[PDB]
């Protein structure tokens, strides 16, 4: 009936993910997200490197109290002589407009209302 | 042909597991183990608490260069006001005797040869 801000989408982890070994093969860590709002929301992901890490689905439209699974694969590598404290993800979302279209749009961020965003610290466990 | 010590069984993680959130439901973390020896080996697991944590299969007989999956479930709880630095697992194994029987025996530890054992530090990520 009245205005409705972008409900804080639940996240698990909420802000701390330690990619547990081994690093000898692409390890896809499943993430849990949920829409804690009243209406749908257009969210997108961004990582320091879109080559090594692979987040899918990168962008999508969640529903009211809808649950979705994420996949963050990490290509193999050598953590014996490589710094591991510069990897961080970004998850933002904004309430879609009245009867928005069926497709993530960039206008949803340059329109009315406010957009939320939180970076998730990455970790590497051996 | 000649004597054969208990090949160091590969572990992933090898000595560091951070049970990533959430803690609102039994989360079973899959572990990777492998027999790096020439013959089978009888191994067993032990945790500080056999009530909260559940490791299965607890004991079994691995084969030469055989891979096996483990399941370490962790009952839900509240990590907002509970110490999380006293949980540690124990994985030991000893080369089975010549044509050993098809069933983990305790005599394999009180016989000839040497037995290996390593504790895996537990962690809790929110």
């Amino acid at each position: 009936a009245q205005s409705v801000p972008p409900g804080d989408i639940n996240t698990q982890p909420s802000q701390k993910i330690v990619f547990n070994a081994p690093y000898d093969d692409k390890h896809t860590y499943h993430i849990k997200i949920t829409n804690a709002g009243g209406r749908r929301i257009g969210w997108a992901i961004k990582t320091t490197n879109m080559r090594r890490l692979s987040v899918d689905p990168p962008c999508g439209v969640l529903d009211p109290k809808e649950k979705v699974l994420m996949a963050v694969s990490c290509d193999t590598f050598n953590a014996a002589t490589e710094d591991l404290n510069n990897d961080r993800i970004t998850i933002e979302w904004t309430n879609t407009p009245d009867g928005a279209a069926k497709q993530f749009r960039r206008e949803w961020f340059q329109g009315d209302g406010m957009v939320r965003r939180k970076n998730l610290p990455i970790e590497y466990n051996l």
Side-chain angles (χ1 to χ4, degrees), chain A residues 47-49 53 83-89 122 124:
Chain A
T47 68
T48 38
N49 310 254
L53 311 143
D83 52 357
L84 294 170
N85 199 78
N86 304 131
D87 270 285
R88 62 201 234 283
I89 319 179
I122 308 296
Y124 297 81

Side-chain angles (χ1 to χ4, degrees), chain A residues 52-70:
Chain A
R52 283 277 104 165
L53 311 143
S54 50
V55 274
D56 321 295
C59 67
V61 195
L62 242 61
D63 246 44
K65 200 165 200 139
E66 144 153 325
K67 316 191 190 153
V68 60
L69 255 303
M70 210 150 51

Side-chain angles (χ1 to χ4, degrees), chain A residues 8-78:
Chain A
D8 305 3
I9 56 127
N10 245 312
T11 27
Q12 317 157 296
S14 173
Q15 223 180 271
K16 245 168 230 299
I17 188 157
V18 184
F19 301 146
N20 282 297
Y23 299 145
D24 201 285
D25 209 64
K26 312 203 247 228
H27 205 349
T28 303
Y29 300 83
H30 294 123
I31 314 180
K32 289 79 150 148
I33 307 164
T34 295
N35 201 350
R39 321 239 240 192
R40 55 219 83 169
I41 58 187
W43 60 282
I45 312 290
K46 300 215 128 167
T47 68
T48 38
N49 310 254
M50 272 262 90
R51 325 302 181 174
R52 283 277 104 165
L53 311 143
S54 50
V55 274
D56 321 295
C59 67
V61 195
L62 242 61
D63 246 44
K65 200 165 200 139
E66 144 153 325
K67 316 191 190 153
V68 60
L69 255 303
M70 210 150 51
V72 59
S73 224
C74 60
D75 268 286
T76 80
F77 70 106
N78 269 316

